[PDB]
Amino acid sequence: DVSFRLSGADPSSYGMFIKDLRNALPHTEKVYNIPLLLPSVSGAGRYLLMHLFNYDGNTITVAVDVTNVYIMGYLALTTSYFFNEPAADLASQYVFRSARRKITLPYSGNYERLQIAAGKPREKIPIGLPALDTAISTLLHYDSTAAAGALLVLIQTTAEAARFKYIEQQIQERAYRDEVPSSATISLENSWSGLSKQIQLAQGNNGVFRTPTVLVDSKGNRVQITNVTSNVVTSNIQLLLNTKNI
Ligand SMILES: *[C@@H]1O[C@H](CO)[C@@H](O[C@@H]2O[C@H](CO)[C@@H](O)[C@H](O)[C@H]2NC(C)=O)[C@H](O)[C@H]1NC(C)=O
Ligand SMILES: OC[C@H]1O[C@@H](O)[C@H](O)[C@@H](O)[C@@H]1O
Secondary structure, eight states: EEEETTTOHHHHHHHHHHHHHHHOEEEEEEEETTTEEOOOOOGGGGEEEEEETTTOOOEEEEEEETTTTEEEEEEETTEEEEESSHHHHHHHTTTTTTTSSEOOSSOOOSHHHHHHTTTTTTGGGOOOOHHHHHHHOOOOSSSSHHHHHHHHHIIIIIIIIIHHHHHHHHHHHSSSSBBOHHHHHHHHHHHHHHHHHHHHHHHGGEEEEEEOOOOOOSSOOOOEEEEEHHHHHHIBBBOOOOGOOO
16 A cells, blocks of 8 residues: 655655655666566555545545546545446455445546536646645545546546656645646646557657647647657656556
């Protein structure tokens, strides 16, 4: 399991949690020196439990699919909650079985659907450690509309940060003051699958991508990534979604 406590949190303890999160995800190969997530894991071992603690010390446990870093659901006191999707329904067969009741959320977990539920795109939702503390607090009592925005915050500050070093740094910059994510941050989130695939295809194409990935950079500039020499590959991405899952 991994943990994170918002109480006394600072850019350092958060960095440590994101490092623990990455290290809990198993792999047997690296591709261009980036851990490659497994094609599949059977039964219970497919799911990592993140124990998160708000500023006052109340807690939820979030179940994470170790093969794609997708949040399946969470446990808040004696009630479990899972996205309305087959992958989550399957996870409910393994985690949080001892909850007194199980609620299916009225939405699945993808960004589009959560943004519909929440009533706004995530461009307009501040993120940061204080927002994570709010997220946690909200998920403590069922409210599907408020939960959608809380889950948007929670996915970005846990899974998207484990995936990209830049996004981890964005959150650390927002340790004591939330801010909406940069468009670069949005771009990386949206390109994770594409990048993971192009890095894997470069293995037999001499480090050249078969198809270029278009990103937005820090300065807000649109740019093409075409081979493994890019800073995105060499420094930024920390985890590759296996092409068997794309
Ligand atoms: C591999 O990617 C690099 C970019 O990371 C390409 O080099 C850049 O692209 C053009 C020049 O062709 C310039 O806009 C950049 O400033 C270049 N940057 C650097 C650091 O060289 C390179 O052309 C690509 N190689 C292949 C074979 O696709
Ligand atoms: O690429 C992975 C991401 O896909 C998004 O559409 C989902 O909303 C995220 O939960 C998931 O982590």
